[PDB]
């Protein structure tokens, strides 16, 4: 359902209501923004102003529209993705009202977050190649484990699902209940960028059997953006499971 990708950008109390359908393609993001005039006034030069953060580039600036009283229009905007980084799209709707000295010429949109997971694929390498890449890679991001999960294996499976990384550590090396686990993860972006992660987690025995998993995840990459974006994704996924 197209409905699962609908993001509300403004509130019903705003003079201009807006919602966006966000379609992420392989190299481009299509924003289809429904804009509705909720006022009795004619909105002249109604313009969707978009700004991007990260390696996102707006391809075309949306043209200004004139909206009749209670009228609606769709504004399409294309944003190009240049690298595997977390992107944020910010926007405002700006309009001029004919004749009314209204103090409101700007509606601020909600932030649209672009997910790095659409660009990350699970990959395989040998332990020797992993150790070599792990020594050679210039950027490290150290994420502290902060989860409500009490099982080490459930936490590892949750990280694998949330990062699209492949576990290289064999199941036999993860087997047995000792309260300690270490695993190596590997992924490649669709741009051919290598991303490595080491998961080092423990169950804090002194806090009892219901104690949350503690430890560190280290992410290494050649690019700063890749290491930063994966680290932010892991930090966000861990916080969602704490609810």
């Amino acid at each position: 359902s197209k409905l699962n990708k609908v993001t509300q950008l403004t509130g019903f109390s705003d003079p201009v209501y807006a919602e966006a359908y966000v379609h992420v393609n392989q190299y481009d993001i299509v924003l289809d923004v429904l804009v509705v005039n909720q006022t009795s006034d004619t909105l002249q030069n109604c313009t969707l102003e978009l700004a991007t953060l990260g390696d996102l580039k707006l391809v075309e600036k949306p043209s200004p529209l004139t909206l009749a009283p209670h009228d609606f229009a769709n504004i399409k905007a294309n944003v190009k993705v240049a690298s595997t980084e977390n992107g944020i799209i910010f926007g405002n709707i700006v309009y001029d009202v004919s004749g009314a000295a209204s103090d409101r010429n700007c509606v601020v949109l909600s932030d649209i977050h672009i997910d790095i997971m659409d660009y990350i694929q699970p990959a395989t390498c040998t332990d020797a190649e992993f150790r070599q890449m792990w020594a050679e890679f210039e950027w490290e991001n150290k994420v502290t484990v902060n989860t409500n999960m009490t099982d080490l294996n459930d936490y590892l499976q949750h990280i694998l699902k949330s990062t699209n990384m492949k576990c290289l550590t064999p199941e036999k090396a993860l087997s047995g209940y000792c309260g300690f686990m270490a695993a190596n993860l590997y992924a490649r972006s669709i741009f051919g960028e290598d991303a490595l992660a080491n998961v080092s987690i423990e169950k804090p025995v002194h806090q009892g059997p219901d104690a949350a998993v503690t430890g560190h995840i280290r992410i290494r990459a050649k690019s700063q953006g890749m290491a930063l974006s994966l680290g932010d994704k892991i930090n966000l996924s861990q916080k969602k499971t704490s609810l």
Partner: peptide
């Protein structure tokens, strides 16, 4: 959590 590592291995890798 972002740190630049300045180990002898990372220098030798960068020099290679």
């Amino acid at each position: 959590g972002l740190v630049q590592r300045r180990t002898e291995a990372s220098r030798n890798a960068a020099d290679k």
